[PDB]
Amino acid sequence: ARKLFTPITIKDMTLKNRIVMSPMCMYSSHEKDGKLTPFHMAHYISRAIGQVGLIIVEASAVNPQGRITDQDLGIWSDEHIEGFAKLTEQVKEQGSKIGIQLAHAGRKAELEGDIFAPSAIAFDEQSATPVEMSAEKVKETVQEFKQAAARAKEAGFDVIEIHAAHGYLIHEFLSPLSNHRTDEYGGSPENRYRFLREIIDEVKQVWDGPLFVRVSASDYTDKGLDIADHIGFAKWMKEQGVDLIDCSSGALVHADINVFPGYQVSFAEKIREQADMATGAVGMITDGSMAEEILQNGRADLIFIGRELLRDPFFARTAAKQLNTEIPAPVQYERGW
Amino acid sequence: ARKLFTPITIKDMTLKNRIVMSPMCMYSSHEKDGKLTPFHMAHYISRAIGQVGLIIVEASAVNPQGRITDQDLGIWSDEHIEGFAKLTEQVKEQGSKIGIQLAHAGRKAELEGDIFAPSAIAFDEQSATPVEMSAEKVKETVQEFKQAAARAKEAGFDVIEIHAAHGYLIHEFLSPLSNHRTDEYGGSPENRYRFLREIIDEVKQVWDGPLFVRVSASDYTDKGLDIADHIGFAKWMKEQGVDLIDCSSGALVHADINVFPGYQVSFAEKIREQADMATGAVGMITDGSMAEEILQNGRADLIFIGRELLRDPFFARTAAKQLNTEIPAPVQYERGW
Amino acid sequence: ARKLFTPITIKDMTLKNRIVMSPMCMYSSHEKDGKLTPFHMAHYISRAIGQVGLIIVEASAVNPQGRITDQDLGIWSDEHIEGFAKLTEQVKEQGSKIGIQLAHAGRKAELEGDIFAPSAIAFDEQSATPVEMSAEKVKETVQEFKQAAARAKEAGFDVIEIHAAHGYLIHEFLSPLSNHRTDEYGGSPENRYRFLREIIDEVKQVWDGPLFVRVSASDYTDKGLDIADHIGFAKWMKEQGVDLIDCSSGALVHADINVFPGYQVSFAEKIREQADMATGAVGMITDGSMAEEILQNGRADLIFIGRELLRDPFFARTAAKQLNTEIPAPVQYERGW
Amino acid sequence: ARKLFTPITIKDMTLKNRIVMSPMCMYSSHEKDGKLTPFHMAHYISRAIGQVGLIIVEASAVNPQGRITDQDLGIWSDEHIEGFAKLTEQVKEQGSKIGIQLAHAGRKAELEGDIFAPSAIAFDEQSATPVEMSAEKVKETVQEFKQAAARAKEAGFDVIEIHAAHGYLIHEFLSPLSNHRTDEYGGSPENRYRFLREIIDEVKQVWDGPLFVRVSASDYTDKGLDIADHIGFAKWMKEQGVDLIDCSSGALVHADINVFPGYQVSFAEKIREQADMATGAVGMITDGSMAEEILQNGRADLIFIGRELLRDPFFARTAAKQLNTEIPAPVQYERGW
């Protein structure tokens, strides 16, 4: 059997294959309340019918002002539990496992009113300057990630992923380019990592299941973070009990990034090798052959697929055919697959 | 531009492209009450996100004993209206038009208790002998199609299609192989067609929107119906106001059928030409090139896609690429399509 | 099995499949003597390795002033026999049958010195006015087609095709738009056809093997030839012993042509049905599904492939895969096909 | 521009792209004289028309008894120069560069009469036991590689590759599993490498152009050679002036090899990184995406394609389309590509 379609167990969770639907914002919560809509349901459940091993729900704000846009999904209120409970149940019924990405847009939040970050530094020339979070505010935000995780557990999610990438709040604390704080949350790598450290420990108090952390393995910028920095954070996350690091990159500030098939794979491979940590590979992986190569050559443990799953919801089937293998089809499509 | 992606107007309905999702039973009404389930919602709505011009909902029984299986959808009760109302609303929200196939399995019903047909002739050796419908029972069934159409209109459907194919009730009345009646519903081509004639006229009393009729253009059997017979029926349907004939074939009785890409297209083109009736082509059509060829060579007006839409929900996108053309993507997928 | 990959016998010739490499000028006779070059050898033989059932060599001029360009292949000299003999031998060694298209560009010849045609009417504004052939010149040309056919037979070709399409010499005689003669070669459909009639009869005197004739089934021009005219010609060719009509279209004069997948298939099916003549379909056919549909629906007997064989020399293999079937691979590629 | 289609200069040779047709035996020298045939010409030249940057001709024996089979190509005689001269000229004319793989089958030679190897050990239970080469015979074989290289230069080849892989002669000397010699050519890694060392130095005396060496980076067998051993040989080859190491693997003896897309890439990456030597990656690479990933992530310098070039001679075009880029088409196919 192909490794891509070989099961894997993480904590109490067993995925039927190594294909993961990468979290992707749909900006479709038109009521601006962070709640799910019929579109979200059809969008996610169709990939479950499509046999994706694990579906990670798009960035979901742990605080309303932590949304990227007012059309984002949210999990800052118990009122968000009802909808998510229906989603997890329906995705699970099709045979897929489901996760949610807990997030906070930080200085990249496109909302009216003050937005927050570790330091009052704008993302770019077009962005509003954020307010530096008070130590009190930082600690309250840590509690919001914990509270959000508790809601995700109640909602029935199998995995929880902390969004510590793409220039958002946590990433902003991690990088010296965006974190100029003079308190316990800034300075040394230990201090810059403190925010994430506290989030992981608190989430641990309410969630014992699989815990992923998505990082931007590089800032591709002089004086910014690079893979060496992230290998360091990874070892600390391993000690804290993080099960897998979802390896993305960039977006802290505009930068020149050479994009190509598997351009972020080196990050997943190095963290896996040097930090002895399971990793998720993502970034222009669009066919089963590359997915299989990545896994067989020990470059990552899970293959995150984003845009290809937008073009082909049934990528699992397509990948199976490309690898000349067979996978179970959803019962209702037996006469077509 | 490509004809396949050029709008077409039928009555007061305008389709953005000429791709139609052929009706396909999902056997997922697990409560056996003919109601829709979350699976049906994700199943159909995902193809609307996928830009299918017109989605025809699977065979929905106009009478509980007219279901193929107890897992079929139904529209024999006002209780079915609420669910269908949500479905049409959500499918239309994506930009697709939606239709429903009104059906009655006749002697091919796989249910407990008496099953009905024009004559007491079983489908095959493994099938129960059906009860010959009394003239009044035939009339009650006509009213049930009428009542079902009224519910469909209320639920918000854009198109209504009468299932007069695949060996089910109406087809059974149409063919001399299954209809041996000597009353007003049998004996001559006109009388064998009477049941359908009354159904069309009655549906017209409560529905003046697009009206489709799916037929099995041939029984592929000696003494059975052939394309010449259906060209005759098409002429009569034209006079009655039918807008398009969905051209399928077979299934009245077991027969040896040579299946291949476009094996039913000749039926669609002959009826279109000889009956001056718009037609829908269906059967082993799996790529944009053939779809465009059928439309451009005037063989049909709409291209019905079945199994390829089970393998690839976003066939519209794939076909556009194959035809070296571009179509609008759902807003949420602009970064991937 | 698939019809596309089922053998077919024409006269004493049996093709292993029904895929034909449509004649395509390579403009590679750099010494301007009409002789073959190493490029031509690799070009044609690679498609034989590729399992194409029948390979038709590009337009080969029966007279030097009948070439389209001075870079064309020729067969107006016994000096051309040696090269063609090597080509047929090597192509047949792979299992493919081979044919040659005998041609004469007429008024579309892009050469220095007088060019000829049935009437002194130029192709367009950027073309030289041709010399009206004297009756004797017409007769000499008929003999040149005969002599060319004799050379083709000697060189080992399996099939001979007369190029009576694309606005070249024979086509020019056939259409009233380009033929205004009032002698035995003009004035009525019979007289306009006379040139072709004499060519067929004379070729028959030295060649009794498969004989094809490529025509432009329509001029797409008011007062020009249309499919009705060609069905008439096909009936006459049938009487003369022509085995198959290769159905192309246009090019006599500039015209607006709606091109799409299978845009010339209607010509092939109408002639096949109304003239009871075997036909070759060509024009935007790029995949196995359409090829099979054309054959199974009785629209043509052979599928001519042009540009797709330039993009994919091994189209036979690709088509087999698309049709979920398998064909024998050349022995040398058994480990790859 | 994509790296796969970015030129690279090695010595005095510039390749227009990084795609290389991996050497592949055709067993088509039916006259058993090691000479080329029309099949070989069409086979190789078609990939040149297909735009492959570099075409490596199949294993060509430096001694008749060094052939794998009596149908192999040879270069053990000046009589082989004439044919090769025509091949290199024609491949170069299409715009591709060409190389030849100098080889000696050793104990895997399937010929009548004594076969040779470093030690009298059979390849497997089905094979004949080879005769241990005398020291004199070994040195004569070194001279045969030199003499063959001289013929390749005269024939017009751009690159010469030494076949030191797949269980053949040189590989047999390199591995302790097959080399039990007690003289200067056996024992220590220095002694086991001596045969290849002498071949490289002698070839250098007659050839100053690009020099490749293909190795089996692992024997996948206990007590056999592994990547660590080959990294060692690579450093020595670097010192000797070898320009690139073509990284294959296995075939010294039967072994359990886990085959998958890019399964030999780790070898190319490690040798490149640790030996500071340019490398060629090969082994189930069938699409442009993986080819691009390998190059962009610095895993190899050239992408060798084998079986995919047997299925798709115009893989370069296919890969270009997969990478959404454009490459020049052969002039004759401008209207198809």
Ligand SMILES: Cc1cc2nc3c(=O)[nH]c(=O)nc-3n(C[C@H](O)[C@H](O)[C@H](O)COP(=O)(O)O)c2cc1C
């Ligand atoms: C429309 C869209 C929405 C996205 N939303 C998210 C998100 O909420 N969280 C996240 O971590 N990444 C997000 N991403 C990044 C993707 O998950 C993925 O890592 C990226 O596209 C690289 O992979 P791909 O080449 O497979 O698409 C998004 C990308 C797109 C195109």
Ligand SMILES: Cc1cc2nc3c(=O)[nH]c(=O)nc-3n(C[C@H](O)[C@H](O)[C@H](O)COP(=O)(O)O)c2cc1C
């Ligand atoms: C699982 C399944 C369910 C189907 N259900 C229906 C149905 O409810 N009504 C109908 O008219 N045809 C039904 N069909 C026939 C299809 O609509 C379609 O006409 C047929 O599959 C031929 O087209 P295709 O080759 O595009 O699939 C079904 C076919 C399949 C495979």
Ligand SMILES: Cc1cc2nc3c(=O)[nH]c(=O)nc-3n(C[C@H](O)[C@H](O)[C@H](O)COP(=O)(O)O)c2cc1C
């Ligand atoms: C480069 C090129 C050369 C051609 N040469 C010839 C020729 O010599 N004789 C002929 O009858 N048609 C010729 N044609 C027309 C083709 O044979 C074929 O009928 C046409 O391209 C339509 O088919 P296709 O879509 O499969 O390419 C040529 C077309 C191209 C693009």
Ligand SMILES: Cc1cc2nc3c(=O)[nH]c(=O)nc-3n(C[C@H](O)[C@H](O)[C@H](O)COP(=O)(O)O)c2cc1C
């Ligand atoms: C029919 C055939 C012939 C081959 N001949 C040779 C050869 O002469 N020399 C060599 O080094 N490898 C030879 N190989 C191995 C290939 O060059 C290539 O390295 C191998 O197939 C792995 O790559 P692929 O997956 O791209 O085919 C051959 C393979 C096949 C299938």
Ligand SMILES: O=Cc1ccc(O)cc1
């Ligand atoms: O909407 C795009 C998006 C990209 C990356 C993220 O992390 C979040 C949103």
Ligand SMILES: O=Cc1ccc(O)cc1
């Ligand atoms: O489930 C298959 C099916 C086929 C044709 C129909 O019409 C109804 C159901």
Ligand SMILES: O=Cc1ccc(O)cc1
């Ligand atoms: O080169 C294009 C060409 C087209 C049609 C012909 O018949 C001859 C040449």
Ligand SMILES: O=Cc1ccc(O)cc1
């Ligand atoms: O013919 C297959 C073959 C494989 C590997 C080699 O090295 C030589 C020949």
